[PDB]
Every structure is written in structure tokens, then in C-alpha cells.
Design a protein around this ligand. Structure first.
Ligand SMILES: C[As](C)(=O)[O-]
Ligand SMILES: C[As](C)(=O)[O-]
Ligand SMILES: [Ca+2]
Ligand SMILES: [Ca+2]
Ligand SMILES: [Ca+2]
Ligand SMILES: [Ca+2]
Ligand SMILES: [Ca+2]
Ligand SMILES: [Ca+2]
Ligand SMILES: [Ca+2]
Ligand SMILES: [Ca+2]
Ligand SMILES: [Ca+2]
Ligand SMILES: [Ca+2]
Ligand SMILES: [Ca+2]
Ligand SMILES: [Ca+2]
Ligand SMILES: [Cl-]
Ligand SMILES: [Cl-]
Ligand SMILES: [Cl-]
Ligand SMILES: [Cl-]
Ligand SMILES: [Cl-]
Ligand SMILES: [Cl-]
Ligand SMILES: [Cl-]
Ligand SMILES: [Cl-]
Ligand SMILES: [Cl-]
Lengths: 321, 316, 318, 316, 316, 317
């Protein structure tokens, strides 16, 4: 290591501009060796073959990591970095090339073992398509306890399971039907006009899901909408899990989601909401789904996703709990 | 029985989903009651090199993949079915021919089927001359609500019947009156002094982005529409997609900063489409060859969905 | 004929009609169960089976469109390459999520069609490589001892378990549906393969012809020399065209691109030449991915593969 | 200037030891034109398929200008004096029939006023060939046309008007040129219609397919047919339609497919022909920059002109 | 004339009733500069990120030229007589330091020989701001700077030389301007470093974050800090780094992210500031046309220029 | 860590036990002693006359190489048997081109000196790097013949734009770092060059073979006749591959694309033949620009150029 250091101008492959006065996430993220996980740590779930649509979401964990590593870790509103020590990257959950059901078991088992072995781990999950939310939440629910889910989404995601299988749109029907979480502990934020079916809306109502449309959010405001509903739900639950489906964002702000359309959230609105929720007690995890780098302009949507990570971390650093 | 053999190109079907594709039928000559689609694939009329002739296909595709279900209404925006009447035959070479095809086809259909409410898919802005002429001349005295960053009153000497000229022709030819023309979204730096002069000189109701941003789009509409509404028999909605901010409609030939945002436009269209005697709506200046993915075609599909929503709402 | 009164109103999306032109679109008919004589298109939009990300499930759509837009007229023939009509049977339903199921559907469907329509010569539009196992098994078990001509840079004999895009010919050989000595691999490319898989191939006595041999002997010369010998030992031949046999410059839309492949005119000629031979039971085209393509170049290449297949068939002295 | 570091907007790296075509090309000032001179014909609405070939004169100029003028083979510049750029022909945005007269009138007067001008014509779609060839024929005399092309281009005129597919039917039917004086190089399998092929044979057109060419070599087939046609004509005109090239070599043509010419083949052929007595002009058609990869096809077209200039320099 | 349908290479549709910037802008002759004039600075090798900002002066020019000169809200054109285009500053292919010297020397001389010249500067990356501002300050007087930016741009100069992230360190360290005359609008959460924010604070820079701006408003925020700084200075100079805009509004900047200004906000603010007395100039940096969608960001930049032109015209 | 059987390291695709990719063979250099070929990137492109992203090519080429089989069927063995060290990238200054060149020369000179058995596999970077790379070779190893595959002479004067990608063989020749007659230029292309530079090169007696000559005689025979003559006046050979030597259809990601170039087929075969010769001191690949490419076609061709080079070395006495 001094054999190589005698070459002052020789650096490892892929190095970028180094500024000694800068601290970027890349300076704070370490590959995880077995060591004890305290707090937030990243994990990738590159599953996208379950998608109804043709999807490149299996590439998102790579591109979101890249956007994240290239961001400054410094918050001017905190007067400090959002990671105090270091942030582990646990790796990627192995995904079966072929069998989607096998892939889901990989996810549930790894997540379960991980949560149990390291009870202080708060997952930062990089999807992957929407279907992963079944396995991740089930692991939270069956390792942590009664869990509330805050689902940012244009869609209910309660699709019937027999037509496609564990498809993109089925995670929450699977969760509700199997009683992994309760309908009234589910807060859906951003449900969008013309993004849903009559039947599926009915199915979420039967189950007492808390539905907040874009229409409601626009008149009442996102943060006030959450203050109005979150307290009630927290009172019936032990933990909260934040599921961010990036297609809740307006197509102009997230062109890289498979299901794009007008009438959605703007990113700064989302970032603020995530930071708010992240400060609340017993936040068990956050996942980001439905980013598709092959559909993106440059990597705008992966950058937007990375900022969701930064603002969640910010919220956690800020929380009293 | 070839249970696993399927029609070419067919995809995921879901019993619990009702998409527009489930409700749109190829027209077979049956009587037309209410909204029906018609394509107008003309774009050589354009001053700018334009692929707007492909818009009818892309907008159809985006519309067909959308849910027909409205949550605000608790019902689908189309009760029974929605005929797609086809495309107007556009000549390869002669643009004046193409305008005759449009007017004469529109005229015969409005005539044969007095309950047809046209949902017109352009095509570039030049088509408005012939679509509105057919409306005025079959339905009577007509008010036009023109969402546009531009006046569209260019001269005809320099380039023939270009996409820039349709409202000059319409005004000069007294087929509509200026005072029944409502222009929403007229944008600073998008227009010409002499052309604005022409519009004022005809008493066009001009509402700029400045006024809309101050007053708000619907309130701006609620102030002038009632007026024009009571001195006309019918209203027609001309939506030029370049009224939208470039960030929201990246696929229009004439993009720039400082336009309407989509949810804003969508609300305004539903509000107008609720009014009595809406004779039709057309969508122009979508160019899928300039678009990102099909963002701007999806925005146009949603303009239609919201128009349909407003029409479903009207009886109440 | 109620629309005739609207002389300028046409069907949605119908374009420039030229009266003196006959395109494939004019001759391809949506199939409605009628008895099938000769060539008929069928789509197999499976691409999830791909090791790498693949929009191959879209190729049947884009190859269809490129075919339809091509003229049906061959000047070397002085006639259209199809006379009456060419049925399009449709697409094999593939499960969105279950891939074993999808391969069972493909086999079941192909088998039922080949049984019920003995004069059907399948023009199969993939879809990725893995469909070859299901399509060829149907052929061998319904038509009989079958020789395979696979154009390909890769042996496609990858392990079936440990990690299935590059497995079809291992499954094929292992289950003895086909004999290695009846397998002719054309275009196998330097640095596209693994010692183990080549050994597996040489172990089953497959006829391997590398790009080096083909560039030395010439492609047609190579074929004339090996093909008749294999026909002597078999009852049918099946043409499997993996488009990645083509140089990246000629087929940019294949997942596995690299330099040193065949050129498209060189492959078209060879396909025409094979398609005149006795008892051609079918042809398939795999590994076209419209999402990786420039414009639709590779779909156009594939569509021309079909045209030259049809052309050879109409030329066949049998 | 008194500002050593101030240059004209958009200046490029200047290398004193290098001479690019940009250093030799000069906008026409009205002087007498002796030898080759560029003229642009930015017309593409006449195209059957949607086409941006009207941008090609610009993109081809740009690629030509950025090239070296020096031929290592000649040991001199393919033009060491100057090469005028006559400008562009005015294209009506709407009326293509009118646009064709513009082209014919302009070429005819330029040709009549400057008998030593050899046009280097930059299209534009293949439809300009009627008007350019008519001007050469009715100005120079009996003209052989060497038409590099995948297609016969003898489409009937009724369907689309004078589209880019009709030019040689118009020429032959109106007796502007004789069939036996038309040499078609590169006619490609599956690119043509029965009726159109038969039309060509009826007029005794000299048809050389890609198959014949791949069997004999392009130059040998040229050495075999050319002397016959020269024996019965006074002038040669070269019409290069870039879709004669394989799609992998000319991605930017509207009609691409496999099995065409390779660019080096074409370049050698064009230089060989340009060496002959009485080459009256060359045109390049069907370059579409909006469909190209980078500007490959416009670069290929720029080299076609460079190799023509080279051959004209080489002629005894 | 003699050839009626022959026009200059590349000429566009001319319309007689429309005055676009391209009719007003004139390639500079050397005559005395009265008022605003354009000058290009095609430098981007000084950027940390791989950047094509050297193409922006051309793309922004192109966008500007195709824009209407007519301001509806003004009832007149923002330019009255003509607007000179001074040309481009010579940028060395290889030596980034030499390029900065060229910029300062050229700029210094022009502002000395033409005391009435108001620079409309088209970059180029942010690194130019040192040479441009220093030139204003050392030729004009005590200078106030309004920096629209998501970043402080006070990076240390040791790690990479005079890169695009350093200009305000160089400016402050050398006391070319005082920190308390530096107004930073749009400083963005997560776009900056602790040590760099401290350097800015140590120097008493006026820092306004996106957060603060979102609370008070952009125009209010300005009306409140500007008067104070104008007391202490003789001129204000406007530095617009386009990456101050949200990524959805300016996709063509190297450093894109969410949470930025919207183009309409920015345009209003530029207009406001440009009304003030003693505006010595404006520069636009960090537009990268090779990263853009179409030329949206170049159009956005063209429009900034128009709202500043508009602003200057409406003050005595 | 093995505790979680379905957890793997970030970015891990699936591995086939029976496949051997260059990825299974390439290791980050820990300082150990270099025996044979080793990779090294030179991410420099600001020195390019045209706007150039060739600074990204070391990454994209490395990715393409790593994903390629190492197995040569024609050889019946892998082209690497041991391992292949990736030394890393030489640090390129964001701003100072001349300092960056010094960095390259000095890292290069230092490395070749401390590891006598290193055969550099260099990844450009634009062509301006050749000056510092070849100088390091010449002054570290001895008299060197240079075979440059190139459409252009690259003898541009240095005064107009400084040490650009156009100037490396001017600098090399002017400073008598090599002799003209030791430079073999393969692929020099019609209309790609200027009268004055062709003259410079001829004045220096450089061996010039145009595409025309090559198309007439064949690339390999052309080489077979001039190469021994130069090996005769030379102790080592260095292979300089500028990829714009390739036809645009085959290498669309090179800043300078035009028709009438070499095809990758011929180039591959030529590099392998040359790399078979005694005393091949190294190879560099320059002028691939990933930002201009279609997919990564041109980086893939570069990766194959490297594969065939190793194959030649593997195959040499
Ligand atoms: C086309 As966009 C930058 O508004 O997503
Ligand atoms: C798709 As190509 C122009 O590289 O052959
Ligand atoms: Ca969703
Ligand atoms: Ca969802
Ligand atoms: Ca308009
Ligand atoms: Ca408009
Ligand atoms: Ca293969
Ligand atoms: Ca294969
Ligand atoms: Ca033609
Ligand atoms: Ca043609
Ligand atoms: Ca900035
Ligand atoms: Ca900045
Ligand atoms: Ca070169
Ligand atoms: Ca070179
Ligand atoms: Cl979803
Ligand atoms: Cl318009
Ligand atoms: Cl894909
Ligand atoms: Cl494969
Ligand atoms: Cl287009
Ligand atoms: Cl044609
Ligand atoms: Cl910056
Ligand atoms: Cl770049
Ligand atoms: Cl070079």
C-alpha cells in the first residue's frame, strides 16, 4: 500500500474530482461487513420482472445509489451532515432471474433475518418495482409489531392476484387479505383521478383504507393532510413504515416512472412530507419504488429519489426519538 | 381450442379494470349520440417542421390505456360506448385539398348526426379553420374558447393556409365574430404587435398569462364566458397544447417558459365542458416526434378525459 | 358500405394507399381457424426469461410492422413471395410472472397447431432465445427426426439449474429431443463462448462452424458442404435464427452485440438457400429487442429474413 | 482589431496549416460561375413518408465545410480556387406544385445564364429530380441519368401528387429523357412493385439490381453499361439517392433496409463517373438529419460531393 | 431580380408583420456601442463536471433570434433600433488560465472604449464570473452582484485550479468585491458544503436560501435586500446561473436536482432588478445544450435576456 | 456475511460457475509485482480539439471488457491464465492539461521502471496521451517502433491549440523521442488530412499506408512487408490504436467519424498478429467517446481489441 502510494498520481479506477473541503455521501457510505447495524442502512432490491409493464426498475438501486453518493451530505438547515457516523450499504437482495415467487421469498427471508439480527436497523430500501412492498412490509410487521403504512401513490395497488400473479399492482391486496397489516392503518396519499378502477377503490373502502386523493391534498395541503390523519393512526400502531412510489409525482417531476401522467405531486412537496414523517416516533423503514432509469431523462428521477433519502435521513437526525 | 393462443398484440387484461380501450368502438355507421372521436392527421400546414400528423395515433393510444373511471364522480366518464369515427383523409401533397376534405367531412357528419359531439384529434393548428367553420355552419352562432399562447391571426400571403392563420381566416370571413372569441393564455414574447392589433381591432376577448396568473384561470373564465355565452347558440373548445408550459408539454413545436400547468388546464376544460351547448372540442399542436416518451399525448388524453367528465356532469 | 357516403373518412391510422403497390400488409390476414396451408406467422412475446434486461417481448410487434410495410414483390422471382394470403395466427399467451408456465403454453400451443394443421410451416417471431426449446420440441415430436440449423454467435448450451436465456440447446440435447450430430451451429464467434459450453457441444458431436471457418470458406459454401449430409440423417430441418449472429453494426438491437458477426445480406442469402431445401418444417427469429434498437433496423433485418425465407420456399424444387 | 481575442460569433478552432472546405466555399456574389457550385433545395413535404430532408442542405453543408479539401490521392485540393454556394431555392411552405416551378425556373435561368456551372445539388427529397433534370435536359441537350437508388421511382402521380416517388415517371412520360438513357444502379429486392418494374422495362430503362451488382462489382457493371449510354447522349447527370446505401451505412434515410451499397463502393463509383466527359451535374437526395445517427448520413453525402469534385478534377 | 426564387443558404420563412430578435440583432461593425450588446464566452473545460456549456452561446443566440421582440405588456419591442452582437471571446483549445486572461482583457478593453456598453453575456460555465465581474469592477466602480445560484461557488482553488465552482472565492479573496455586496439567491438545501457556507458567512455574504425564498417570496426578498446594497455601491451586475432553476424547468444544466426556482419566478425577478438604476450588465451561465431536452434551457435563457431587456427599457 | 445466503454485494449480477469472464480475472492492484499485461486508464479528453467525452472511455471500456468471455476458442484456452491487474487511473487535473500530461509521463516512467515486466494495456482518453505514454516507453525500454492505426497523421502544430489530441506525433518526432521511419501509420484516410501535415510526416520518412493502399494489398499483407523492416531498426514495438481508424458504421462513438474506414474484423486480426511479435512493449486505445456512442458499441470494439491483443501475446514466443 506504500508500493502503490509511491505513485502520487495513481488513483483507483473510476475516481472522481476530490475536494478536501467537501463531504459527499460517497465519503460516508461503506460496504457492510458483518458489523452491528445502528440506525439507517441502505439495501437494494432489484426486482422488476413482476411488473405488468416492461420495467427497468431492477437498475434503479444502482442509479439511486449513484445519485445519492454524488450529493453533498451537508444540510444547511441542520448545520451538519445528515449522517453523523457512517451509513452502511448492506448489499442487494439476490433476485431470481426466472421465478418471481422465489424472488419474493428471498426478500422476506433476508429482511426478516436482518431485522431480527440487528434490531436497531432502520431500512432504507431501494426498489425495484412496486411488488416488493409485500415482502418488505411483511418482514417489518412480523419482526417489529403492529405497523402503520404511509403509502405515497397515484394508485391503490390492490389488484387481484390471479390474472398476473404477484404482479406490480397486488402488494396491498396481498397484505390486506392476509391480515399482515390492517386497512385502517394504511394511509394512501396522492390517489389520482383517472389512475384507478371502480372495483379497486371499492375494495380499499371495504377494508377501511384511509384514502387521500390529489384533489383533497391540493385543497387541504399535503402536510396538513398528514397531520390530520397520522396522529389517529399512530395511536393504533407501534411502528410506521414509509412506502414511496415515485409515480405519485407528476410526470414533469418524475419522467422516469413507468406509469406517468399529469396531476401529481411536485418533488419539493414530497421531500417536505417525507422529512416530516421521518421525525415521528418509531419510523421502522422507508422504501422507494417504481423508478425506471431506462425511461428517465438523464437521471432526474433517480436524483429525486436520492433526495427523498436525504430528506428522510434529515428527518431522522432531527427526531427526538 | 388454442386456449393459450391470443390475438396479435393483445396484452394483460383485468376483469376489474375498465379502460377506455374497453369502451371505444370502431364506428360502423350507427347513429352517433354524444361524444365521438375523429382524427385529423394534418401537419404539412405547419410553418415549423412538424410530426403533428402522428398525434391522432399517439393520443388514441394514450387515451385507450387510461382508466375510464372518475373518482370524483364515482362512475365512468363514458356510460355505454364511445365511437371512434376514423381519420379524415389527408392528401400527401395538396394542403388546400386537405382542408376541403376536413370541412366537407365534418360538415356531412354534423349534418347526418345532429347529436354528435366532436372530440377532434389534430393535427396542427391550421385544422381549426375547417372544424370551426363546419360547427358554425351546421350548429349556428358559435363562441370559441381558444387556449393558446398565440393569437393565431397570421397573414395568408406568405405561406398559404399555414397553422398560424386559422383565426384570421375565420374572422375575415365573418364565420365567427371577434367578440365571441375567447383567448386564454396569450403569452408575453409569444406574439406580434400588428397581430395583437388585428385581434384588438376585432374585439377579441384577450386574457393573457399575466391576467390569468393574477386572477386565476377559472375565475377569469367565470367572468367572460357568461357574457359571450348569452349572445351565442353554441360553444366550441379549441385546445392548443402549446398554451402549456414547456415543462408540462415538451412535445409542442412552439415551446417556452411561462405557460399554464396541466392540472390547471384540465380543471378549466371540465368546467367549460359542463356548460350547456358544448358543440365540441379539438386538441392541436401535439407533436409526438418532439415529445419525451409520450408525455404530451398523455396530457392531451387527459384533456379529453376531463372534457368527458364535464359532459357526464352537465345534466346535474 | 354505409361509410361510402363519407368519401374522405378512413379507418383510424390508415395511410397512403398506392393502387399499383402490393405490400405484405395487403396479404397478411388475421387468422380465423381456417385450415392452414404453408407459412403462417405466430408471435412468442417472451423476454422475461432473458438473463439480461430485454424488451424482446416487443419484437413480434415491431417485426410485424416492418414486414407489413415491405413490398411482397420479389424481382428475382418475377412474382410476390406469397400468392393468396399469409395467416397471422396471433401471439402465444405468456404468463406475466410464471415462466415455466409460459414455456408449457408455448409447447402445448405449438404442438396443437402442428398436429391439427399438418401443412403449417411456422414463421415464429420471438421473443428471446429460450423459446427455442419449446418450439423445436413441438416440431420434433410432431414432425419427426429433426435437424436444426441455428445461426448464432453463442452455443446456447448454458447450465439449466445453478443460474435460462442461453439454455435451450442443453435442455434440447439432454432430453434427446434432438441429436447433436443433427445440430448445425453457424456463426459461432471468437470470445462469445466458454470452454465448458464448447466442450459440452463438441461432446455431443454438434457441427460447429465458427466465424473464422465461415470467413475462410464462405457461408453458402459452408452450408452446401454440411447441410445435405445432415439431411441424409434426418426427416426435417428447422431454421433457428438468433439475430445476434449479426455484426453489431448490422443488428444494433440485439442484447448481445459485439464486432465480428455476419452481415445481413450474407444471412439473407443463406436463409433463402436453406429455405429451398426439402422438408423445411419452420423458421424462428430470436433476440431482437426493439428497446435497444436504432430506429427499427433490426426488426427490418428480421422482417427481411422472413421475406427471404418465403422466397426460398417458393423457389424450392420440392 | 484592437481586440485580438474577439472573434466572430461561432468561430471554430483555426489551424493555419489546415485548409478545410469552409476556407474555400464562398457565398455567391454574382460573379460568373465556372465549374461546380453548390445549390440547396430544402423541399421535403413532397415526401410520401414524414421527412426532414428539408434540413439536409444545412446539415450536408456543415459536414462538407468541416472536411479537409485535400486529396492525398490527387496530391492537391479538390478545389484550390473557390467553390461558390449559390444559396437555397425558395420553397413555398404550402404549395409543392409551385415549389417545383420555383426549382425548375431557377435552375433553367442559372443554367442558361452561366453555361459553365456544374450544379452540385443538395436535396431535399427525391421529388426534386423532375425539376432539376428537366432544367439540365432543356438547357444542355440529350442527357443520360445515372440514378443510384433502391427504388425505381416511377410511382403513378394520381395518388399523392408529385411526391418523391414519382419523378422518373414524370420525366419519362413527358419525354424529358428516354428510358434507354436512364441507368438505375442498386435496385433492391423487396423495395419495388411489380407494376412499377414493368413500367420501367416498357420504357427500356437500364436496370441493375443489387444482385447483379454484387455478382459483377459496381465498377465493372458501370464500365459495361456506361459507354453504351454515352454513345447516345451528350451529357451525364448523377442523381445519388442515399437510400441506395445499406441501412448500417446510411441510417438517416427515410427508407432504410438491409442489402444495399456500402459507402466506399458508392464513393468510388461516383468519382469514376465524375471523371467522364460532359458530366453536367450531381444531386444528392433523401438525406434526413432528423432520422440520422449523429450526422453520419450527412457526412456520407458530403464525401459523395468530395469524390465527385475529385473525379471532375481528374478528367482529361 | 434576375433569380426571384433564389435566397441565402439557410434562410427561413420570412413574415412581414412579425419582428423577431433576428431582425434587430446585428453582427458588430466596431461602431460606438450604445446600450446592451451581446458577447459570447464559449468556455466549459473549466467545469468540474463534463460540460458542453461552450455550445450555449450559439444555442441561446439561436433561441433568442427566433423569439418575438415584442413585449405585449410594454406595447413595444424591448429593443428599439438594433442590438449588436459583439461576437465570441477567443477560447484557447487547451489552456484554461489563458482563456480567463482573454476574457478579462477583452472585457476590460470593451468597457473602456465603450462606456455606454451594457454587457449581455452568454457563457459558458460559471468560471467566467471572475473575469467578467473583475472587469466590471475594475472599469466601472464599486460593484454589487446579484448571484442567482443553487451553489455558493466559493470552492478552494488548489484542488482543481480556477474551475467553475471557484469564481466567488477568487473575487472575494482578492477583494474585487465585498461579501456584503454579494447577494446569493436560491442557495439550495443539499447543494453546498459546511466549510463553503462558512467561508461565505465569514465574508458577510447576503445568503438567501430556497427555504427563505419560498417563505417570503423572490420579489419581496429582493425589494428588501437590494436597496441596502445599492447604497454602498455604484453599479449592480446580475449573475444568472441557470442551475438555480428546478431540474424540471432547466434539464440542461450539469448540476440538476429538485427544489429550485421556477422559470416564471426567475423571469419576473430579472425584470425587476433590470429596472433599477446602474445595472452594469447581466451574464447567463451553466446552460449545457448537450444535456438539454430539445433546447428548453437555452429558450429559458433566451427569455431571461428578454425580461432583462424589457426591464432596462422601462426605467429612466 | 455468509450468514445471509440471499444477500449479495451491491451491483452483483448473477454468476455462472461454468463461465469465465474477464471480471473473474481482473484484480485491483495492491502494489504487488507486475508480470505481463496490466490495465491502466488515462481519463483525459479536455485536450481534444472537438468537444470530447473520451475521459469516460476508461470506465465504459473497462465495463465492456469485464463482461466479455476470456476464452479464445481459436486458442483452446483463456487469454489470461493468471490474473490481470488493474493498476488504476492516472490522476488527471480538472484544469491543467500540461500538468496532466506530466502526471501521465511520470506515472508511466515510474511504473515501467519499477516493474520491468509490465506490458501496459492503456485506456484513453483522447489521442494527446500518446506523447507521454510513448515517451515513457521509449526512455524506459529503449528504441521503439510505433504502429499507429489512424485515419489521421496527428502531426498538427502545437502553437494553435497547445498539446491537443492532434499534436502527439509532432511532439514525439520534433523532440526526437522516436524516428519517423520507426512510425508505421496504418489507415491514413482520404480527405481526413491536410497537405502540410502529410508533408511533415513524409519529411520525417514516416511509413504511411493509406486506406487505398490497404484496400489494394490487404491489411495483414501490408503489415507483413513493412513490419520486419522496422523491427530491424528497433528494440521494442508499441501499438497505438486510434479507433477513428474504423469506419463510422463500425465505430460511431469516435469524435471524428467518416465513411471509408477499416472494419473491426480487419483491425482485430491485425492487432492480434502484431501482438504476436517479439518485444511488444504495450498497447493503447484512444479516441473512444461513450457520450457520442450508440449503446456502447465502440467501447465493446475497444474491449475486443484488447482481447485480441492479449490473445496474440498469449500466442507469442
Ligand atoms: C420534459 As421535463 C424536463 O419537463 O420532465
Ligand atoms: C446502426 As449503425 C449506423 O452503427 O450500423
Ligand atoms: Ca403507483
Ligand atoms: Ca403503485
Ligand atoms: Ca396556435
Ligand atoms: Ca399556439
Ligand atoms: Ca446468441
Ligand atoms: Ca442464441
Ligand atoms: Ca429515390
Ligand atoms: Ca430510393
Ligand atoms: Ca450553480
Ligand atoms: Ca454556480
Ligand atoms: Ca484519428
Ligand atoms: Ca489520432
Ligand atoms: Cl404500480
Ligand atoms: Cl401556433
Ligand atoms: Cl429494455
Ligand atoms: Cl443468447
Ligand atoms: Cl421528423
Ligand atoms: Cl424513394
Ligand atoms: Cl456551480
Ligand atoms: Cl459531452
Ligand atoms: Cl485525431
Amino acid at each position: 500500500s506504500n508500493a502503490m502510494d509511491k505513485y502520487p498520481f495513481l488513483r483507483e479506477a473510476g475516481s472522481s474530482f476530490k475536494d478536501r473541503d467537501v463531504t459527499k455521501m460517497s465519503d460516508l457510505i461503506a460496504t457492510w461487513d458483518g458489523q452491528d447495524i445502528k440506525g439507517p442502512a441502505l439495501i437494494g432490491v432489484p426486482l422488476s420482472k413482476s411488473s405488468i409493464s416492461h420495467s427497468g426498475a431492477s437498475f434503479a438501486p444502482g442509479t439511486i445509489r449513484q445519485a445519492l453518493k454524488h450529493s453533498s451530505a451537508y444540510s444547511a438547515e441542520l448545520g451538519e451532515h445528515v449522517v453523523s457516523e457512517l451509513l452502511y450499504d448492506l448489499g442487494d437482495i439476490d433476485i431470481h432471474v426466472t421465478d418471481i415467487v422465489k424472488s419474493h421469498h428471498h426478500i422476506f427471508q433476508t429482511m426478516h433475518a436482518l431485522l431480527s439480527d440487528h434490531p436497531d436497523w432502520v431500512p432504507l430500501i431501494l426498489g425495484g418495482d412496486n411488488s416488493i412492498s409485500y415482502s418488505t412490509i411483511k418482514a417489518i410487521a412480523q419482526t417489529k409489531g403492529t405497523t402503520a403504512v404511509i403509502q405515497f401513490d397515484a394508485h391503490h395497488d390492490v389488484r387481484n392476484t390471479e390474472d398476473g400473479g404477484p404482479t406490480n399492482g397486488t402488494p396491498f391486496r396481498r397484505l390486506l387479505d392476509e391480515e399482515i397489516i390492517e386497512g385502517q392503518h394504511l394511509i394512501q396519499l396522492g390517489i389520482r383521478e383517472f389512475s384507478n378502477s371502480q372495483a379497486y377503490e371499492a375494495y380499499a373502502k371495504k377494508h377501511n383504507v384511509n384514502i387521500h386523493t390529489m384533489d383533497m391534498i391540493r385543497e387541504k395541503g399535503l402536510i396538513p393532510t398528514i397531520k390530520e390523519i397520522l396522529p389517529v393512526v399512530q395511536d393504533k400502531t407501534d411502528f410506521i413504515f414509509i412506502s414511496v412510489d415515485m409515480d405519485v409525482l407528476d410526470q414533469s417531476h418524475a419522467p422516469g416512472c413507468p406509469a406517468i401522467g399529469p396531476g401529481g405531486l411536485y418533488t419539493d412537496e414530497l421531500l417536505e412530507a417525507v422529512k416530516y414523517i421521518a421525525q415521528q416516533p418509531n419510523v421502522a423503514g422507508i422504501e422507494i419504488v417504481e423508478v425506471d432509469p431506462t425511461l428517465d431523462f438523464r437521471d432526474m428521477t433517480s436524483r429525486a429519489a436520492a433526495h427523498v433519502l436525504l430528506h428522510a435521513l434529515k428527518g431522522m437526525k432531527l427526531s427526538p426519538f
